[PDB]
Design an enzyme around this catalytic site. Structure first.
Site, PDB file in Angstrom:
ATOM      1  N   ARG A   1     -63.226  25.268 -22.377  1.00 14.75           N
ATOM      2  CA  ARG A   1     -62.799  26.084 -21.251  1.00 14.75           C
ATOM      3  C   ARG A   1     -61.933  25.261 -20.300  1.00 14.75           C
ATOM      4  O   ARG A   1     -61.857  24.047 -20.440  1.00 14.75           O
ATOM      5  CB  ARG A   1     -63.996  26.655 -20.490  1.00 14.75           C
ATOM      6  CG  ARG A   1     -63.555  27.868 -19.669  1.00 14.75           C
ATOM      7  CD  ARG A   1     -64.581  29.004 -19.423  1.00 14.75           C
ATOM      8  NE  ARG A   1     -63.851  30.281 -19.347  1.00 14.75           N
ATOM      9  CZ  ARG A   1     -63.735  31.159 -20.338  1.00 14.75           C
ATOM     10  NH1 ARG A   1     -64.592  31.194 -21.346  1.00 14.75           N
ATOM     11  NH2 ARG A   1     -62.818  32.112 -20.290  1.00 14.75           N
TER      12      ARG A   1
ATOM     13  N   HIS B   1     -56.097  40.047 -28.160  1.00 17.88           N
ATOM     14  CA  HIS B   1     -56.832  40.947 -27.281  1.00 17.88           C
ATOM     15  C   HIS B   1     -57.203  42.225 -28.028  1.00 17.88           C
ATOM     16  O   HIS B   1     -57.592  43.209 -27.408  1.00 17.88           O
ATOM     17  CB  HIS B   1     -56.039  41.264 -26.003  1.00 17.88           C
ATOM     18  CG  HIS B   1     -56.330  40.379 -24.841  1.00 17.88           C
ATOM     19  ND1 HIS B   1     -57.569  40.341 -24.239  1.00 17.88           N
ATOM     20  CD2 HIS B   1     -55.572  39.503 -24.171  1.00 17.88           C
ATOM     21  CE1 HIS B   1     -57.546  39.480 -23.235  1.00 17.88           C
ATOM     22  NE2 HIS B   1     -56.343  38.953 -23.181  1.00 17.88           N
TER      23      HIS B   1
ATOM     24  N   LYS C   1     -59.729  44.436 -29.927  1.00 16.88           N
ATOM     25  CA  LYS C   1     -61.159  44.566 -29.690  1.00 16.88           C
ATOM     26  C   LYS C   1     -61.740  45.539 -30.718  1.00 16.88           C
ATOM     27  O   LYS C   1     -61.046  46.424 -31.206  1.00 16.88           O
ATOM     28  CB  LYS C   1     -61.412  45.026 -28.251  1.00 16.88           C
ATOM     29  CG  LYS C   1     -60.816  44.134 -27.158  1.00 16.88           C
ATOM     30  CD  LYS C   1     -61.675  42.927 -26.782  1.00 16.88           C
ATOM     31  CE  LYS C   1     -60.970  41.891 -25.974  1.00 16.88           C
ATOM     32  NZ  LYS C   1     -60.261  40.974 -26.865  1.00 16.88           N
TER      33      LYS C   1
ATOM     34  N   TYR D   1     -71.273  37.274 -21.224  1.00 16.45           N
ATOM     35  CA  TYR D   1     -70.902  38.586 -21.731  1.00 16.45           C
ATOM     36  C   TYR D   1     -72.120  39.294 -22.322  1.00 16.45           C
ATOM     37  O   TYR D   1     -72.166  40.530 -22.318  1.00 16.45           O
ATOM     38  CB  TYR D   1     -69.803  38.532 -22.791  1.00 16.45           C
ATOM     39  CG  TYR D   1     -68.389  38.458 -22.235  1.00 16.45           C
ATOM     40  CD1 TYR D   1     -67.857  39.502 -21.487  1.00 16.45           C
ATOM     41  CD2 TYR D   1     -67.574  37.366 -22.494  1.00 16.45           C
ATOM     42  CE1 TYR D   1     -66.570  39.447 -20.986  1.00 16.45           C
ATOM     43  CE2 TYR D   1     -66.281  37.303 -22.000  1.00 16.45           C
ATOM     44  CZ  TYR D   1     -65.776  38.345 -21.245  1.00 16.45           C
ATOM     45  OH  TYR D   1     -64.497  38.254 -20.758  1.00 16.45           O
TER      46      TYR D   1
ATOM     47  N   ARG E   1     -71.481  39.058 -17.123  1.00 16.19           N
ATOM     48  CA  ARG E   1     -70.085  39.437 -16.959  1.00 16.19           C
ATOM     49  C   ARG E   1     -69.961  40.908 -17.342  1.00 16.19           C
ATOM     50  O   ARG E   1     -70.240  41.270 -18.487  1.00 16.19           O
ATOM     51  CB  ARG E   1     -69.224  38.510 -17.831  1.00 16.19           C
ATOM     52  CG  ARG E   1     -67.710  38.600 -17.681  1.00 16.19           C
ATOM     53  CD  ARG E   1     -67.033  37.354 -18.256  1.00 16.19           C
ATOM     54  NE  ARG E   1     -65.568  37.392 -18.193  1.00 16.19           N
ATOM     55  CZ  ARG E   1     -64.828  37.270 -17.082  1.00 16.19           C
ATOM     56  NH1 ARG E   1     -65.412  36.995 -15.928  1.00 16.19           N
ATOM     57  NH2 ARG E   1     -63.518  37.434 -17.137  1.00 16.19           N
TER      58      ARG E   1
ATOM     59  N   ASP F   1     -68.785  44.383 -18.418  1.00 16.12           N
ATOM     60  CA  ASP F   1     -67.768  45.016 -19.238  1.00 16.12           C
ATOM     61  C   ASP F   1     -68.233  46.441 -19.524  1.00 16.12           C
ATOM     62  O   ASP F   1     -69.198  46.900 -18.913  1.00 16.12           O
ATOM     63  CB  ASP F   1     -67.469  44.177 -20.469  1.00 16.12           C
ATOM     64  CG  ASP F   1     -66.050  44.280 -21.023  1.00 16.12           C
ATOM     65  OD1 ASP F   1     -65.602  45.423 -21.320  1.00 16.12           O
ATOM     66  OD2 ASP F   1     -65.407  43.207 -21.162  1.00 16.12           O
TER      67      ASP F   1
ATOM     68  N   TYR G   1     -54.645  37.224  -6.871  1.00 16.09           N
ATOM     69  CA  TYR G   1     -54.913  38.617  -7.201  1.00 16.09           C
ATOM     70  C   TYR G   1     -55.238  39.407  -5.934  1.00 16.09           C
ATOM     71  O   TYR G   1     -54.892  40.580  -5.828  1.00 16.09           O
ATOM     72  CB  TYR G   1     -56.036  38.738  -8.243  1.00 16.09           C
ATOM     73  CG  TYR G   1     -55.636  38.166  -9.593  1.00 16.09           C
ATOM     74  CD1 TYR G   1     -54.467  38.580 -10.217  1.00 16.09           C
ATOM     75  CD2 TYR G   1     -56.366  37.158 -10.202  1.00 16.09           C
ATOM     76  CE1 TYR G   1     -54.051  38.026 -11.415  1.00 16.09           C
ATOM     77  CE2 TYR G   1     -55.968  36.606 -11.408  1.00 16.09           C
ATOM     78  CZ  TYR G   1     -54.805  37.038 -12.014  1.00 16.09           C
ATOM     79  OH  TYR G   1     -54.392  36.511 -13.204  1.00 16.09           O
TER      80      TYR G   1
ATOM     81  N   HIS H   1     -65.302  42.373 -15.382  1.00 18.48           N
ATOM     82  CA  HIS H   1     -64.374  42.427 -16.502  1.00 18.48           C
ATOM     83  C   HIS H   1     -64.212  43.858 -17.012  1.00 18.48           C
ATOM     84  O   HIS H   1     -64.109  44.065 -18.218  1.00 18.48           O
ATOM     85  CB  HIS H   1     -64.857  41.486 -17.613  1.00 18.48           C
ATOM     86  CG  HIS H   1     -63.789  41.057 -18.542  1.00 18.48           C
ATOM     87  ND1 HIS H   1     -63.820  41.320 -19.899  1.00 18.48           N
ATOM     88  CD2 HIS H   1     -62.627  40.423 -18.300  1.00 18.48           C
ATOM     89  CE1 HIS H   1     -62.719  40.831 -20.463  1.00 18.48           C
ATOM     90  NE2 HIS H   1     -61.977  40.288 -19.509  1.00 18.48           N
TER      91      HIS H   1
ATOM     92  N   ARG I   1     -48.593  40.403 -18.824  1.00 11.87           N
ATOM     93  CA  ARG I   1     -49.016  39.666 -20.003  1.00 11.87           C
ATOM     94  C   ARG I   1     -49.424  40.623 -21.121  1.00 11.87           C
ATOM     95  O   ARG I   1     -48.926  40.523 -22.225  1.00 11.87           O
ATOM     96  CB  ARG I   1     -50.174  38.775 -19.561  1.00 11.87           C
ATOM     97  CG  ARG I   1     -50.592  37.816 -20.649  1.00 11.87           C
ATOM     98  CD  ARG I   1     -51.776  36.955 -20.266  1.00 11.87           C
ATOM     99  NE  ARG I   1     -52.085  36.160 -21.460  1.00 11.87           N
ATOM    100  CZ  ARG I   1     -51.242  35.332 -22.050  1.00 11.87           C
ATOM    101  NH1 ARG I   1     -50.154  34.941 -21.418  1.00 11.87           N
ATOM    102  NH2 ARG I   1     -51.511  34.854 -23.252  1.00 11.87           N
TER     103      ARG I   1
END
Lengths: 445, 440, 439, 437
Positions: A90, A132, A134, A153, A161, A163, A318, A351, A372
């Site tokens: 990371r 990306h 999924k 996650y 996290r 989602d 942001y 997320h 992006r």
């Protein structure tokens, strides 16, 4: 019909039973569901994720995969992750053994049991394209989340996290997605096994990746629609780059809101084209809800007590984006048309991705709705059309819980300004805006 | 194991019989072996060289190729040379000569293809090496001309290994077929109407990009306890070849030996050398004396600008030695100068202890590291089965060498002829010496 | 003191008598005052303007100049206008200046063309000042029908007569040395005047000389008395530009700005926002789109240039949009001037009741980099000009609407069709940003 | 030599002399087009720069609808330039009305965008493919091209019956254009706006950059052949063939171009021919035969300066090569016929090669636009009657320029023109203009 509704009306659509759509509302439920479906899989398991981490959470999943393959050696098990992400720590870590190194150990410690881990490079360098895509495809179902597989996650060990989590049983759709992955990714140029100790280094496959990326630029799902616009449907979508079918559908979807559009994005950094759409909706008198994370719910956020690092400036950038946006549209905030929500729950991280169009459309996606995702990364989604409101209980329960940890922003001034920021942050940002690099940053992250 | 040995342990390796590896120790033997194998070839002859010269030596080879194809028209004969080099003199071209040959031998099909590795010679040349004949590869750094083949009494010293190995030769033959021969911007040099470089400029750009990640792909069949060979190929900084050369050097538990014609090591290889010296290991470096360089012009003859290169390589050697004189004194660092009257030196390779032998076309300079298409074979001999031949080869290499015991034994710029001295001072004034060392 | 007040405290300042400052409030009064001062001039007349037009208004002035020189041949009469502007129609005067000189032999009234750059779009003469003996009659106005309110239609500017020996000398002398005797200045009353390409290199060297030409004089006045400070500049780091920048933050109470074309550089906008954040007041007086001289009535045939008023409105609306909070707290006040089809050309800056910048500076990126600009900075710490300052602002505001909401300004959607299409085309390719830096 | 080698090794499709028909006048071309539309049995593929909402264009579109009504199995397609068709009431708007006023009858009109903006690429592909024939002209479909209503625009007209070639061209259009990214129907009222498909067009253009005909040659160099050619950008096979074609003239090269604006490379070829002692004929329009020319009585507009700029190009060229004019090697012809307009394109190499093309032989066509051609090789002189008749009639309305001075200089031009041109040349924009038009 107007050109936007026409685009949606003429999307190919796969029919879907209401009984075969299951929502889950918490990362822990998602973990358990994934494990359950891995155990009970009979034909195939295709795990596509950004990454699968060498931590308790990720181990849990990989061990469950090896175990299912041991008990059913005829089972078709594949794991696909990002090539570059799997081969690094990371950001700014003390750094150690990588995930790819760990995938190698696992394969050696489990001979006879065939669980291949492929690395997908979407571009030659991580900063210019990541996987990306999924989807966990298990037999005739897809368990679709934005989540990668790691501690937070999966809500191992007390911190999570947030989602979204949807299980969709649908033979045709899962086939289309499984088959698309097989042909375009797994058998694509420049895909390389990460469980091979002799895997190439990025520079050696650089030209393979360039050709691969071009192949992906117009790879799309091909299937015939079996469902009309009066019945519950699902439409898988996939894209790379500005003119993908996904991007076009996201663009056309927003103006079809006859009443209200809802958006989740982790990093508020909308491309101009999506902003213009938002403003058009607001002008037409419609409603727009935008649910983003507080700066403190961002995973790069560094508490003000700890030593500040360069990367811990992203949440601030942001926030500056959000504050600039709100500033320009304060009129619409006041008329209760534009609603901006900040999510925050102690030091857990946010997320959420997606798009709700009235009560009729639900886009579930990995798409962060930023420049992006619009040009660089390989993105996908499922578009749920529910013209009969059959998912209304679950849709409403999901939005209920999403909003639960949110504050409504009634005034752009309620957001801190650069002046309010810590000193090192403040100096960094002023330096960046002097030379106009803030604009570049917002196009690459 | 440390990451360097790990890299080597996990290299795919093709097994190899000791009986199927033949060394040759002199350019004349190499000539005769090449001719012999051309005569007796039954299936295919693939000749890749930097150039094939319009001289007695080169004629000999091309005539032997035409002759073998006449006697066996089913034989698959191909010659590949550098596109740019074949279409100029040294500093009526070879390509013009290849055209005449084709016209004077109708019916007999011996195609000569020009490979452009870049749009201009200075930015990439074909340093791929290999004569692939049936199931064997006769591997040398040598091009085909008078001196490389020791026609007519004066020679250019290279290394010569014949390796009979079905799998390896197939891999190399097939790699050449797909990536080079059928590549964009490869063009026949025996065609009188061959395009000019500008016309194919864009083809060459795309070609070069294709080459940037073209590598051998094959499954290893041999472990690290047996005699093995591993073909390697690369273009640019991050090629598998370059990485293997980098990892190979630190695996020396005792001693590393290097041959290079032009002492001009990239920084990364120098750093490795210094690490070995610091770890207490030995490093032997065998280079040519300035007078054994092919650009060297005797001091009686009219001096030309190009005749400054041998001097620049000497300056490099002297600067290096200067910094590492301590290790010379402890008999760890050994620098050898090869010299044999006015014959020329063209040895390349790397020996790691008694276990590894890299044979290559790679001059181990910045040019070879970034610009040119390079290749090699990596011989792993963990059982010392080639020990007689390895030792005989090194014996003869060293025979014409002086050991440099002190950097001062090498002439300084002050000792150089006047025209040379003035030229070099002019170059270093404007700092062009640094550029030169990155392009030659 | 903060760095902004320090900058102003340390400006050289010339003392000034309250009796020697006369305001005028209407273009017609300005015309008559100019004619009066031309008649009664005894030593020198130096007329610097963007242009002097071949129309009734401009003729009036040039004839009055010839007449004054006839009656006093020892009088030093000079006219300086922009080189490029004088040699074209609106979207020539030089030809007319030639005729005048031929029709009046013996009488020496030289008309010089100043080229500030090789092409008009890259620099114009925005220096302002009518220097008459020991006075300066300072206005943004050029000399034509509307600026002088000949014939029933007018262009609103500001008009100040300042009698001050030292200041007028400094300005007269600066013009003499840097402009009149500068490279590439050329007479426009000469029939054989060069063409721009022939003097191209002269103009390049001239412009570089101008890049650091500044007034040099010793301050004679402290910060407790009525003062005037002449300022002049070309390019980003001129003393004028620095003073404008530092002036704004010294507002302890309120800043007022006039500009014809709302197109503030970002740096001046940031200042405005800081004032608003500190709780101060900011008043901005601009023209309605219809009070712009490029505005074409919607009945007439539309032309490309008639899009400019719309672009300035878009700028104003974008600005207001971002600062609507401050409008609501009665801190930020935006005024639109409009009086039938008369046109608006007000420039200046008021800092509280203490400072008054009178200038030709449109406060836009063009003026900040490209054009030769100047001003006078009046420091009135004792409020001696209060009657006139207040009367001037009274009349400026009289033809104004206050904008209480950015939505009160029309959006692109509300614009005529040809305009709408043009603007959408421009913003597609991002040329709107370029346009705002060159006009 | 390398030039003849290039031509010798071109793939070539064999061709019967019986199956090549020339037409010599725009009216004949109109009638032939209508006749072939009526009698079509399998397919009609109409590719043009534009199809105009005027009497001439209506005639054609109505004939298409009518043929499709009478044979619903007929495969009818119309392809025009995306940008040109959409510039009050546009052609695209008209294509929409037509489709609504004729329900059941399927006549799709596709817009091809060759670049994101018209000025950077247009559809200069040419060909009416009808069953096994190609009716090939530079003409778009409007009043003047079809000589409706008494005023005409002169082009060239060749019908070539050839199964293989028409298949190759029909199939190439199908795969590369019709099914290409960013092609969009113009008969759809909801058609996207250019900005929305901007990225599609960029990818499309890159696909086109190396799209070429792929087919095996069936014919040697001793027999009548045709070779279809297509290209976009500097290194297309078309451009290479045009380049190599010119030096193969053993006797004489003839060129038609509407706008004299040759790229430097083609000029160098011309000069080489002249030096080798060969002949070069160049047939262009008088400034007054240009469609942008505005009579000197009417109100002048900026665009009406183009004919003058092309004249300046011609005069500069002639100026440099006056020696060769004098030796009767270089022959420059000006076409002019009252206020009719000139639109001839092509290249003749001796009596053996005939390039028929849409290619204006200018820098624009060389880099920006999608161009195509047919290359007729007639080594046995089988088309000699028709070739000669065609050149006869082309020349009929021509003056030979014997001296560069016979062309007006800038000094002779009307005042507004003169001022504009002097302004342009001051800042050197004349050179840019010649590369974009």
């Amino acid at each position: 019909r107007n050109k936007h509704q026409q685009h949606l009306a003429q999307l190919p659509k796969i029919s879907q039973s209401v009984d075969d759509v299951d929502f889950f509302y918490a990362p822990a439920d998602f973990r358990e569901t994934l494990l359950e479906k891995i155990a009970s899989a009979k034909q195939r398991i295709c795990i596509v994720a950004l990454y699968l981490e060498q931590d308790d959470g990720g181990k849990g999943i990989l061990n469950a995969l090896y175990e299912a393959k041991r008990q059913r050696p005829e089972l078709d098990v594949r794991v696909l992750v990002d090539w570059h992400r799997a081969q690094r720590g990371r950001i700014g870590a003390a750094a150690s053994n990588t995930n790819a190194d760990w995938y190698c150990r696992m394969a050696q410690e489990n001979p006879g049991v065939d669980v291949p881990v492929y690395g997908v490079p979407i571009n030659t360098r991580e900063a210019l394209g990541v996987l990306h895509f999924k989807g966990f495809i298990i037999d005739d179902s897809v368990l679709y989340s934005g989540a990668s597989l790691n501690d937070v996650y999966l809500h191992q060990h007390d911190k999570y996290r947030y989602d979204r989590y949807h299980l969709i049983r649908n033979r045709k759709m899962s086939d289309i997605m499984f088959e698309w992955v097989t042909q375009n990714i797994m058998n694509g140029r420049g895909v390389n096994r990460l469980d091979d100790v002799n895997r190439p280094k990025s520079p050696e496959i650089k030209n393979d990746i360039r050709l691969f990326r071009q192949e992906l630029r117009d790879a799309a799902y091909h299937f015939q629609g079996d469902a009309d616009n009066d019945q519950l449907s699902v439409t898988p979508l996939v894209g790379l780059g500005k003119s993908s079918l996904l991007n076009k559908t996201i663009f056309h979807l927003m103006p079809c809101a006859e009443q209200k559009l809802t958006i989740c994005t982790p990093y508020f950094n909308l491309p101009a084209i999506l902003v213009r759409n938002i403003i058009q909706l607001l002008r037409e008198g419609k409603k727009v809800e935008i649910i983003v994370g507080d700066k403190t719910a961002n995973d790069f956020y560094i508490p003000e007590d700890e030593p500040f690092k360069i990367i811990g400036a992203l949440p601030y950038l942001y926030e500056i984006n959000l504050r600039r946006f709100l500033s320009r549209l304060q009129y619409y905030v006041n008329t209760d048309q534009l609603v901006v929500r900040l999510w925050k729950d102690d030091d857990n991280t946010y997320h959420l991705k997606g798009m709700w169009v009235d009560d009729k459309w639900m886009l579930i996606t990995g798409n962060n709705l930023n420049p992006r995702a619009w040009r660089l990364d390989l993105e996908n989604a499922i578009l749920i059309h529910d013209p009969q409101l059959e998912l209304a209980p679950q849709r409403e329960k999901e939005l209920e819980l999403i909003r639960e940890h949110t504050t409504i922003v009634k005034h752009y001034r309620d957001l801190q300004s650069i002046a309010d920021y810590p000193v090192k942050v403040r100096k960094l940002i002023r330096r960046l805006r002097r030379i106009r690099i803030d604009r570049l940053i917002s196009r690459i992250l």
